[PDB]
Amino acid sequence: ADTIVAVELDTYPNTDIGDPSYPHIGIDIKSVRSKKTAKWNMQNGKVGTAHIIYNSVGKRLSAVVSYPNGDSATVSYDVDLDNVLPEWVRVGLSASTGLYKETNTILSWSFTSKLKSNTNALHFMFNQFSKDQKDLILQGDATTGTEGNLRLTRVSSNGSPQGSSVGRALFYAPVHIWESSAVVASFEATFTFLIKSPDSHPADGIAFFISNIDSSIPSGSTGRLLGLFPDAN
Amino acid sequence: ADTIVAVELDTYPNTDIGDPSYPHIGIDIKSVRSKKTAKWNMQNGKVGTAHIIYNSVGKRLSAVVSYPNGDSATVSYDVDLDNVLPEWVRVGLSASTGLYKETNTILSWSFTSKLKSNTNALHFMFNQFSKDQKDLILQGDATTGTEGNLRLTRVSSNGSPQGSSVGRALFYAPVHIWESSAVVASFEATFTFLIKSPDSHPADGIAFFISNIDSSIPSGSTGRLLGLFPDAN
Amino acid sequence: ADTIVAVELDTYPNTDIGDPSYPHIGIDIKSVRSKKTAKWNMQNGKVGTAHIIYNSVGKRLSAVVSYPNGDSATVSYDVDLDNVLPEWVRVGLSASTGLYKETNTILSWSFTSKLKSNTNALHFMFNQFSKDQKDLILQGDATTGTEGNLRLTRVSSNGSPQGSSVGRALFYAPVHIWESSAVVASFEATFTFLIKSPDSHPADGIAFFISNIDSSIPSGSTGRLLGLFPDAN
Amino acid sequence: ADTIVAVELDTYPNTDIGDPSYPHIGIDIKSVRSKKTAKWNMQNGKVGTAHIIYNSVGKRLSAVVSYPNGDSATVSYDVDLDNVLPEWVRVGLSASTGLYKETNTILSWSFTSKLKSNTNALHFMFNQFSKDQKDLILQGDATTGTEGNLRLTRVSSNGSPQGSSVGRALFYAPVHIWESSAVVASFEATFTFLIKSPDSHPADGIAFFISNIDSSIPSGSTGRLLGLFPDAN
Ligand SMILES: O=C(O)Cc1c[nH]c2ccccc12
Ligand SMILES: O=C(O)Cc1c[nH]c2ccccc12
Ligand SMILES: O=C(O)Cc1c[nH]c2ccccc12
Ligand SMILES: O=C(O)Cc1c[nH]c2ccccc12
Ligand SMILES: [Ca+2]
Ligand SMILES: [Ca+2]
Ligand SMILES: [Ca+2]
Ligand SMILES: [Ca+2]
Ligand SMILES: [Cl-]
Ligand SMILES: [Cl-]
Ligand SMILES: [Cl-]
Ligand SMILES: [Cl-]
Ligand SMILES: [Cl-]
Ligand SMILES: [Cl-]
Ligand SMILES: [Cl-]
Ligand SMILES: [Cl-]
Ligand SMILES: [Mn+2]
Ligand SMILES: [Mn+2]
Ligand SMILES: [Mn+2]
Ligand SMILES: [Mn+2]
Numbered sequence: 001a002d003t004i005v006a007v008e009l010d011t012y013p014n015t016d017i018g019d020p021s022y023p024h025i026g027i028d029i030k031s032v033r034s035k036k037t038a039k040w041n042m043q044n045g046k047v048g049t050a051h052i053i054y055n056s057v058g059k060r061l062s063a064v065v066s067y068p069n070g071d072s073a074t075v076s077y078d079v080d081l082d083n084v085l086p087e088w089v090r091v092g093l094s095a096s097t098g099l100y101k102e103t104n105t106i107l108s109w110s111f112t113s114k115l116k117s118n119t120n121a122l123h124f125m126f127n128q129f130s131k132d133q134k135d136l137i138l139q140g141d142a143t144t145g146t147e148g149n150l151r152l153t154r155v156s157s158n159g160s161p162q163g164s165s166v167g168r169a170l171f172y173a174p175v176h177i178w179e180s181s182a183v184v185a186s187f188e189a190t191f192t193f194l195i196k197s198p199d200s201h202p203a204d205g206i207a208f209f210i211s212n213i214d215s216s217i218p219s220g221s222t223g224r225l226l227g228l229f230p231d232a233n
Numbered sequence: 234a235d236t237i238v239a240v241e242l243d244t245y246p247n248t249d250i251g252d253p254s255y256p257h258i259g260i261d262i263k264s265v266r267s268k269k270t271a272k273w274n275m276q277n278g279k280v281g282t283a284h285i286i287y288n289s290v291g292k293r294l295s296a297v298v299s300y301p302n303g304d305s306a307t308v309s310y311d312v313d314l315d316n317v318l319p320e321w322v323r324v325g326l327s328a329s330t331g332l333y334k335e336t337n338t339i340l341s342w343s344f345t346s347k348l349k350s351n352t353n354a355l356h357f358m359f360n361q362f363s364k365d366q367k368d369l370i371l372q373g374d375a376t377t378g379t380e381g382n383l384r385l386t387r388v389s390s391n392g393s394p395q396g397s398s399v400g401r402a403l404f405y406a407p408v409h410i411w412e413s414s415a416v417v418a419s420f421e422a423t424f425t426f427l428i429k430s431p432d433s434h435p436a437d438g439i440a441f442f443i444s445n446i447d448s449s450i451p452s453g454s455t456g457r458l459l460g461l462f463p464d465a466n
Numbered sequence: 467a468d469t470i471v472a473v474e475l476d477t478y479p480n481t482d483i484g485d486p487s488y489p490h491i492g493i494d495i496k497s498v499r500s501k502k503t504a505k506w507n508m509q510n511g512k513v514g515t516a517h518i519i520y521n522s523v524g525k526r527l528s529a530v531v532s533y534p535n536g537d538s539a540t541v542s543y544d545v546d547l548d549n550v551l552p553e554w555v556r557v558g559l560s561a562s563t564g565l566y567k568e569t570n571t572i573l574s575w576s577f578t579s580k581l582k583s584n585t586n587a588l589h590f591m592f593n594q595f596s597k598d599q600k601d602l603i604l605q606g607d608a609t610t611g612t613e614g615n616l617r618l619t620r621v622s623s624n625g626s627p628q629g630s631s632v633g634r635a636l637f638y639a640p641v642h643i644w645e646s647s648a649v650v651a652s653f654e655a656t657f658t659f660l661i662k663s664p665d666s667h668p669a670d671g672i673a674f675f676i677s678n679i680d681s682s683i684p685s686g687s688t689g690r691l692l693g694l695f696p697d698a699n
Numbered sequence: 700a701d702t703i704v705a706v707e708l709d710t711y712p713n714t715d716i717g718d719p720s721y722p723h724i725g726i727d728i729k730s731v732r733s734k735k736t737a738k739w740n741m742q743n744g745k746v747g748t749a750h751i752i753y754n755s756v757g758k759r760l761s762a763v764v765s766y767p768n769g770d771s772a773t774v775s776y777d778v779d780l781d782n783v784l785p786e787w788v789r790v791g792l793s794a795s796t797g798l799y800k801e802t803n804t805i806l807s808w809s810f811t812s813k814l815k816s817n818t819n820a821l822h823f824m825f826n827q828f829s830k831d832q833k834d835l836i837l838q839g840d841a842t843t844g845t846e847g848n849l850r851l852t853r854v855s856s857n858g859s860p861q862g863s864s865v866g867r868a869l870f871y872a873p874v875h876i877w878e879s880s881a882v883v884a885s886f887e888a889t890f891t892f893l894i895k896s897p898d899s900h901p902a903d904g905i906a907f908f909i910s911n912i913d914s915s916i917p918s919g920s921t922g923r924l925l926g927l928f929p930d931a932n
Contacts, residue, residue, distance in 0.1 A: 049582075049584055049649065051523070051649060051650050053521050053523055053524065053650070053652070055519050057517070057528040057529070057530050057540055058524055058528040058542050060526055062524040063523070064523050064649055064650060072649055076523065088365075088367045116515075116656070117361065118515055118532040118533060119360050120359055120360060121358040122356070123355070124355050124356075124406075125352055125353060126353055127352050128350065130412075132321075134409070135406045135407050135408070135409070171406065172405060172406040173357075173404065173406035174367040174368050174405065175368070176367070176368070181536060183515065183532045183538055184530060186519070190582070213367065282815075282817055282882065284756070286754050286756055286757065286883070286885070288752050288761065290761040290762070290773055291752065291759040291761040291775050293757040293759055295754065295757040296756070297882055299817040300817060301817050305817075305882055309756065349889070351748055351766060351769060416765045417763060423815070554831075583827065586826060587822065587823065587824040588822070589820065590820065591819060592819055593818050593819060594819060596875075598787075600912065601821070601872045601875070639823075639870065639871040640833040640871065641834070642829075
């Protein structure tokens, strides 16, 4: 029943549900079957940066993911989010493991939404997460720690990631993501992540998403559904 | 039981509870008995701008209130808010009427909090308020409308303000206002207001305040207590 | 010899140089012959707002122009500005009159450029212009005044605009608009304008532009060339 | 003939010109004889962060310098900069060596100035410096490199710092630092630095400063004068 717009960093090819035959970044409009994808070389144990950009003028949801060595993947998709999202939303991060696993560690997260009419703005930045993060809604296995990081999916004491895990972090305050009379409705999101795995293959990935205010983890949305969708339709 | 730090725009002299013999702006640390005040010429029916500034280095809570014609009042008070406030807070606007009354109309409100260590940031801006303002907590008589304004205290259909009124607006998300390891903890707040009264004297005023997350209007905090304090101590 | 990327608010149809048969907004890549245009209802004597948005991910230069009554025109054009502009630029506003004329009054101008790698930023905002505006380069007839406005084209003492006029304002500091290793290079510009004319038709329009550092008004670039181009090619 | 307001990170005690008997941070109003100082433990070879804060309401110039291990020094001084500085200024960084020496390496520098009336803003951020930094004015020995850093004072090929060196970096654009009608005139500056020395004692230090537009290195302002002052008065 949730409405989802997401950028997925998808570490695991699930070819039978329309994934390409490689790790990819994807734009997901109300379906895990990405509307557009690009090949992504996920660098095990390295800190990546994801950037997400939209404005209501160009009506183009863009994402780019890069690592320090400079290797980057970009994906863009033409979509009017006025026709997709509710006016009011929550913004969040989601990650899953299944049969295979990885750390889904968030080191930092920033977001900006603006409505310019004829301005209303929300901006937050986390470069360190604290134990009792009162402006975050933690769902499922997602924890904030003393190490200053957001662990979306459960990690063992020994620092090793665990399978069949799902967790999300949503910003506490609802966001006014569009308003019919806004001349420009724009949002930007950036997060840094550390995906590390000793597994034969890492899985399943990390998503930035926008949803209805009351959005919660769909039941059985572990693994390939990235904690966003109740099925693969 | 609430902990309150406020800047009060006090339109009504209550001399028996330590108000000066004129309308004033005041810095209130856990008491309506302002720690410091300055004379303020409130201009009936005109749009004022209040600016509030603090940083943990100078440890000086400053406020200035001005009108378009340029007449301004300033008040500063040396205080370590690390020693006053809880780590996590909500920020809000409050206004009251009593025996005398005024419009307590907010046309715009912006806030920025930052912690710089060895950055975490929250920024919001409302230049228009909407009917269902999902990122605001409205308490008491406070309403948001189609006129794009926040009415802290009850106004009649005919546009006239009503007595014995109290309302507040708090931003939905808790704010991390200080952190022991922050090198610089700073906040800025700005709001524009229209106080108008056909009364013999306007009352009672408008406050920007910071409180515990779960802060609510103290019972009988109408009139001279500005919806912040349960008594005049 | 200058390299120009501009958004033109074109009040006058010059049909013989590829203008449409109506006032329009246009994206100009190294030619006054706009790569893309949209019909624009210019509202005589009213304050308009222009917004310009680009990012190096979507590679889409977008502009929207609106007035308070809400009537707006939008134009978008897919272009890699890494392949058009020099790395370092100046940003500016330009306006012209010819055989016909108008006020080309700028009431406010803001700009933001960012490079995010694996951040460098420039932001300025003018909501009032002063007599000796030391962070602006004024070219041709462009003046700043006590009325707090930038007059791009010459106005008489009696407040009436004059024909065959050209003036520009460039921000003093060069801008690093792209860098080969930037993951995201983005810029946003906003300005408010008042075009007013008692003429049979207004002319010629206002442009936001990006150029080489040493860009100057091309000789004979009054009227339909908007002070940007030395010819209509 | 220059007018100087500076925060000095002073690594070398020059006791005969009013330095305390230890490395210190200082607020300098038109004199190298700091109006106020605080003891500073400079950590050889470590990256420090300096923060500078002023607003025209509190009228308190504050500085804090810290290192990752959390050791920090703070100094505040009550001063009306409306009565000290010209309306228009340039902002910059300065460093010197003399008989003793150190690296005066700047890794990052950000600045924000705002005038709020009844807003004009300038903001820049350098987290990487490039070889041809067109928005910086380099004076004396100051160089920008491929290592992404600003070297205020001359360093040998072998990476060792050199004595009797002075260099400054000023932002290209003049800043409107105060305006008589501004309700709030505020500025913030942050820079990160790496001072390293194999010398018996490091010298001489790094300063953030504000000056007249046409400010240049005073002759013989190497060593204890930090490239800011022509004498020790
Ligand atoms: O830019 C200005 O000075 C006026 C202004 C503030 N907010 C605005 C939103 C839309 C159009 C104009 C403005
Ligand atoms: O300024 C930089 O480039 C590094 C940096 C980012 N956030 C900081 C907070 C405190 C000290 C340094 C930094
Ligand atoms: O986001 C962070 O905490 C680290 C960071 C600061 N500037 C950056 C630019 C690109 C990628 C990561 C960062
Ligand atoms: O805050 C608003 O909506 C109006 C506004 C924009 N700039 C200002 C500067 C001073 C006082 C009010 C405003
Ligand atoms: Ca998958
Ligand atoms: Ca009172
Ligand atoms: Ca034309
Ligand atoms: Ca010294
Ligand atoms: Cl599968
Ligand atoms: Cl399924
Ligand atoms: Cl009383
Ligand atoms: Cl009482
Ligand atoms: Cl023509
Ligand atoms: Cl021609
Ligand atoms: Cl000496
Ligand atoms: Cl001397
Ligand atoms: Mn996928
Ligand atoms: Mn009072
Ligand atoms: Mn045209
Ligand atoms: Mn000294």
